[PDB]
Amino acid sequence: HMVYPTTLHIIGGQGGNAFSFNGQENAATLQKLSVSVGGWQVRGVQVWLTDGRRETFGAMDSSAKEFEFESGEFIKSLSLWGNGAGTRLGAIKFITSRSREFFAKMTDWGLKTEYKIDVGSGICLGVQGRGGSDIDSMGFIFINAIKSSVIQDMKYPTMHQILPNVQMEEIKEMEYKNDTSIVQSYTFESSKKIIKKSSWSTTNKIESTFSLSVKAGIPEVMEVETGFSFTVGSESTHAVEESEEKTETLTFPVTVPTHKTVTVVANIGRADIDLPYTALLRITCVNGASLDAPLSGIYKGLTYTKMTAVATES
Amino acid sequence: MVYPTTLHIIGGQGGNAFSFNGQENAATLQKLSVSVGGWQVRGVQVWLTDGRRETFGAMDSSAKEFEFESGEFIKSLSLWGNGAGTRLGAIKFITSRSREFFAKMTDWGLKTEYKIDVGSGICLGVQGRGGSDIDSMGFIFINAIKSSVIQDMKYPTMHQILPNVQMEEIKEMEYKNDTSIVQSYTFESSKKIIKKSSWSTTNKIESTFSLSVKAGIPEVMEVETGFSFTVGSESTHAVEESEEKTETLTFPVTVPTHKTVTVVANIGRADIDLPYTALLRITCVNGASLDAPLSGIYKGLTYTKMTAVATES
Ligand SMILES: [Cl-]
Ligand SMILES: [Cl-]
Ligand SMILES: [Cl-]
Ligand SMILES: [Cl-]
């Protein structure tokens, strides 16, 4: 018993030359459809995907009726009609997740048997069928009902060759003046609110179409003896665009020699991070089949080091 | 013994005591204006983030002011006596964004600069003594902060208002059985949903502190009467949070001979708008703490699980 990540039910005749306009390999999906109608057939379709690809099948006159999907709008239901003879595609009807309707039909011959299509998830990867002068046959490729959409195998392939730009900023300054002849001891304390940020760029509307999560560690900064290095922290699950608020702290004892002053300044390092990334988008269906698409882009991040301090005697 | 605030008052012995402090509601210093004479600080006017405003001593045309930006705190502060040590003589501070404010006496020698421990740099107000002039003053600071957590979350009107669950359709399919025996099919559906939670805050606590909320979310729950609100499992949240997920439905469809069953997948969506009360707790690095009661509105968006109506023709 085999299961599949996509579903395709083609309708019409046996004529024409095979065509396939599929955004499967990069998770590109149907953005816009334009349909031209003849007397006894669908004459042509123009189809746009979310990655910019645009293709025409059959032929397009100016009876052309269009529909552009909104971001996050999917297909609730779809019906295809043959032309009655069983030799052409006769009509296309769909209704979206937002109740918007699109209907393109034969002008001359009336419609006959209506095939109601299982749309799976309603997320369409494009179309497949046969065409020449007309659309002999066509179906819509759908991803079956989705269980999860996770970006994983996260890599920062240039991180190992780049140094962090860490800018220091002062947080607090305090002075202790010992004008006695007994050593003194105080406790210094300081805190700072910080907001860390992580963004993975996405394309082809995958952020609005799929509920994305990212299983990965994020770029952090490590202070070593020589300077600063990039590492990647513990793996966890993230939104594609995320921020984390936190309070950093620092405390230590300060010993103040007899007849001396010590001045303490607390600082933190802040790094804007801009790095290319590679990962894979795995879409896993309810049925257990899956779809992988390689991803490439830019990680933008904001991070901080731990707080430090300089104590100087005067 | 340890305290959640630190206060060091500089100046003379004279005048009447004042304390102008946002501790009880975690309101902080928004703005300060200071008037100076020849041998003293003449007056201060202070505004907190909850709209309170008060003046001590006397204000005149000499006055110079400083208004804090959101998220700006104090990095360093010095105060000087007047060098007779009868009055406050000067105030100086530098912020977390390196803006400076200095106001002093016009004559006279400033003598010993007292460099002040500003704790966390988050100022709750001022305290000192004043008559005609500012005899003495200090700034009240929260000591260094370890955490800032909103807890004991309650929704008091929750049991008294009924959810408004609007239903949406997700998927329709038709199963026609033109055969002489019963047929069985699998129907599957999925939908991306965005859940949202939002606890209102005031007095800039959201930009001064890094807030987290330890609490359950209002959710919708099913009974025979229909739908009521309930509070979910407890976890840690940001004040303003969204959670993306994919809801799914799978069930078998049985179609009698020469019958059609039409299956519509739906989901229920509820906007929530409820009053809340809670406690802001600020815990210091030193182990002390500061509690402030909170009130506001919780806004939310939640979803029921997916369901399906199967209708026999
Ligand atoms: Cl299909
Ligand atoms: Cl100290
Ligand atoms: Cl007095
Ligand atoms: Cl914030």
Side-chain angles (χ1 to χ4, degrees):
Chain A
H1 192 271
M2 204 169 311
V3 285
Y4 306 92
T6 66
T7 182
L8 176 62
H9 190 150
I10 300 181
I11 258 63
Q14 322 306 288
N17 298 327
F19 70 84
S20 192
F21 192 52
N22 185 354
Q24 189 170 284
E25 68 209 312
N26 69 343
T29 57
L30 179 55
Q31 195 166 333
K32 185 183 182 170
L33 182 65
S34 187
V35 183
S36 279
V37 289
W40 76 105
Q41 72 276 76
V42 175
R43 289 277 282 128
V45 186
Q46 191 167 19
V47 190
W48 295 244
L49 301 181
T50 49
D51 67 349
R53 293 165 64 199
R54 174 183 139 269
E55 273 179 52
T56 300
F57 309 109
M60 296 290 281
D61 57 60
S62 58
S63 84
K65 223 196 165 224
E66 295 192 332
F67 190 95
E68 179 149 36
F69 289 85
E70 293 173 307
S71 293
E73 183 179 17
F74 55 103
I75 292 163
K76 180 160 69 187
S77 65
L78 163 71
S79 291
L80 302 180
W81 289 254
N83 69 348
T87 72
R88 305 293 130 96
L89 179 70
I92 299 159
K93 181 187 184 120
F94 60 79
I95 301 164
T96 74
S97 57
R98 317 265 177 81
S99 302
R100 293 206 304 168
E101 202 170 309
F102 176 75
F103 190 31
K105 39 146 43 154
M106 280 179 310
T107 52
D108 292 349
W109 290 45
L111 303 173
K112 304 194 174 153
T113 32
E114 182 185 355
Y115 300 93
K116 292 207 163 64
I117 309 304
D118 190 333
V119 303
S121 70
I123 310 309
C124 177
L125 293 164
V127 297
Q128 189 156 275
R130 311 178 126 143
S133 275
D134 315 321
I135 303 303
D136 293 75
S137 58
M138 201 190 246
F140 284 79
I141 305 157
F142 287 105
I143 301 162
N144 279 322
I146 297 166
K147 182 168 77 234
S148 71
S149 288
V150 302
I151 300 183
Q152 63 192 72
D153 303 337
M154 180 56 74
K155 275 150 186 157
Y156 308 101
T158 82
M159 193 183 82
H160 81 289
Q161 308 159 354
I162 288 179
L163 290 215
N165 180 20
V166 180
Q167 288 276 102
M168 299 312 289
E169 45 181 280
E170 307 191 329
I171 296 168
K172 168 164 180 176
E173 165 165 0
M174 191 34 188
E175 199 164 85
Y176 310 89
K177 180 174 153 61
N178 179 5
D179 45 23
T180 89
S181 68
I182 299 153
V183 61
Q184 287 169 344
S185 214
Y186 303 85
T187 299
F188 181 86
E189 291 172 354
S190 169
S191 49
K192 193 188 166 61
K193 169 177 196 194
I194 64 168
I195 305 186
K196 291 150 67 49
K197 298 188 187 187
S198 275
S199 170
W200 290 271
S201 67
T202 62
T203 190
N204 309 342
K205 290 210 186 60
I206 62 162
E207 77 294 329
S208 53
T209 308
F210 297 109
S211 108
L212 302 174
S213 60
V214 187
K215 183 168 144 291
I218 59 138
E220 303 292 14
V221 157
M222 191 158 289
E223 190 177 53
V224 294
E225 199 167 350
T226 63
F228 289 107
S229 202
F230 282 132
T231 56
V232 12
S234 325
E235 176 195 284
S236 64
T237 296
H238 298 274
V240 145
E241 202 133 294
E242 190 153 285
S243 92
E244 190 195 1
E245 316 197 353
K246 223 143 76 163
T247 306
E248 287 297 324
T249 64
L250 186 64
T251 185
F252 51 89
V254 181
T255 98
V256 186
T258 62
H259 303 101
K260 233 82 192 183
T261 292
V262 358
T263 304
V264 176
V265 183
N267 303 288
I268 199 171
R270 174 197 195 267
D272 281 293
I273 300 180
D274 187 340
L275 291 178
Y277 82 83
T278 65
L280 89 61
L281 174 56
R282 171 162 302 147
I283 297 163
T284 300
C285 302
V286 171
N287 74 18
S290 71
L291 229 33
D292 287 357
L295 285 195
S296 165
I298 75 199
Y299 173 85
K300 281 208 267 281
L302 177 58
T303 204
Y304 287 83
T305 65
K306 300 298 177 199
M307 283 174 67
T308 58
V310 184
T312 118
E313 192 174 298
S314 71
Chain B
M1 229 275 124
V2 307
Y3 303 98
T5 72
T6 174
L7 173 56
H8 191 187
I9 291 169
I10 295 309
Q13 310 306 304
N16 301 309
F18 63 89
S19 189
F20 173 67
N21 177 346
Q23 187 159 353
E24 277 182 332
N25 58 348
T28 55
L29 180 69
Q30 181 151 354
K31 187 178 176 183
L32 175 67
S33 173
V34 180
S35 292
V36 297
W39 54 288
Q40 76 271 273
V41 172
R42 255 251 268 187
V44 150
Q45 189 168 23
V46 184
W47 296 247
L48 305 182
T49 55
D50 63 358
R52 297 160 66 202
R53 163 163 70 77
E54 203 170 342
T55 295
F56 311 93
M59 301 288 284
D60 68 10
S61 295
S62 83
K64 279 286 129 68
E65 61 183 51
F66 187 84
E67 178 154 23
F68 285 84
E69 308 160 6
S70 292
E72 186 173 23
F73 60 94
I74 292 177
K75 191 216 317 236
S76 65
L77 165 88
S78 287
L79 299 174
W80 291 252
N82 72 354
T86 52
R87 301 286 189 277
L88 183 71
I91 294 166
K92 189 196 186 188
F93 68 74
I94 303 154
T95 67
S96 70
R97 311 212 174 132
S98 290
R99 293 159 75 213
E100 192 179 304
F101 178 78
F102 187 31
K104 49 155 162 164
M105 270 168 154
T106 56
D107 203 282
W108 241 235
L110 301 172
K111 236 122 285 174
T112 317
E113 175 170 9
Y114 302 86
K115 274 157 137 74
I116 303 296
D117 180 4
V118 307
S120 70
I122 311 301
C123 181
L124 294 166
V126 301
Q127 179 164 308
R129 291 176 154 110
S132 305
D133 307 326
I134 304 298
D135 296 84
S136 65
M137 179 178 303
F139 289 73
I140 306 174
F141 290 103
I142 303 175
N143 281 311
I145 295 173
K146 198 198 167 192
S147 60
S148 298
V149 184
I150 291 174
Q151 64 203 64
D152 304 6
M153 178 61 64
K154 287 170 155 74
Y155 312 83
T157 80
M158 187 166 79
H159 57 189
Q160 292 160 217
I161 95 165
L162 280 207
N164 175 28
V165 186
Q166 298 281 116
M167 294 293 192
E168 325 182 0
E169 298 184 346
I170 299 166
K171 170 161 182 191
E172 185 176 346
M173 179 54 178
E174 186 167 277
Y175 297 92
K176 216 200 303 304
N177 177 14
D178 287 324
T179 84
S180 72
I181 193 160
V182 71
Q183 302 293 8
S184 275
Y185 310 81
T186 315
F187 177 87
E188 288 180 330
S189 186
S190 67
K191 176 159 176 78
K192 162 168 187 191
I193 55 153
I194 306 185
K195 293 182 149 161
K196 316 198 155 152
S197 294
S198 181
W199 290 270
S200 63
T201 59
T202 42
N203 306 341
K204 304 208 180 173
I205 60 164
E206 81 295 325
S207 63
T208 301
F209 306 107
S210 57
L211 294 178
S212 50
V213 194
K214 199 184 56 147
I217 313 184
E219 286 168 9
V220 160
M221 133 172 274
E222 204 148 58
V223 272
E224 92 289 57
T225 182
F227 292 115
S228 62
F229 287 127
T230 187
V231 184
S233 192
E234 177 171 288
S235 60
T236 284
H237 306 261
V239 138
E240 196 107 327
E241 206 170 60
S242 96
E243 189 197 14
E244 301 212 343
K245 50 191 289 190
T246 308
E247 219 59 54
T248 70
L249 180 64
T250 196
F251 78 105
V253 178
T254 287
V255 196
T257 168
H258 298 108
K259 254 52 162 68
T260 295
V261 358
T262 297
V263 171
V264 190
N266 302 289
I267 200 173
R269 174 198 200 278
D271 287 299
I272 314 192
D273 194 319
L274 289 175
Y276 83 81
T277 67
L279 193 73
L280 173 58
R281 170 160 292 157
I282 299 166
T283 306
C284 294
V285 173
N286 66 10
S289 65
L290 179 176
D291 288 337
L294 289 183
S295 267
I297 76 163
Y298 175 87
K299 291 197 188 200
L301 181 66
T302 188
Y303 287 89
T304 63
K305 54 159 170 50
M306 285 177 64
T307 54
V309 179
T311 303
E312 198 171 303
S313 278

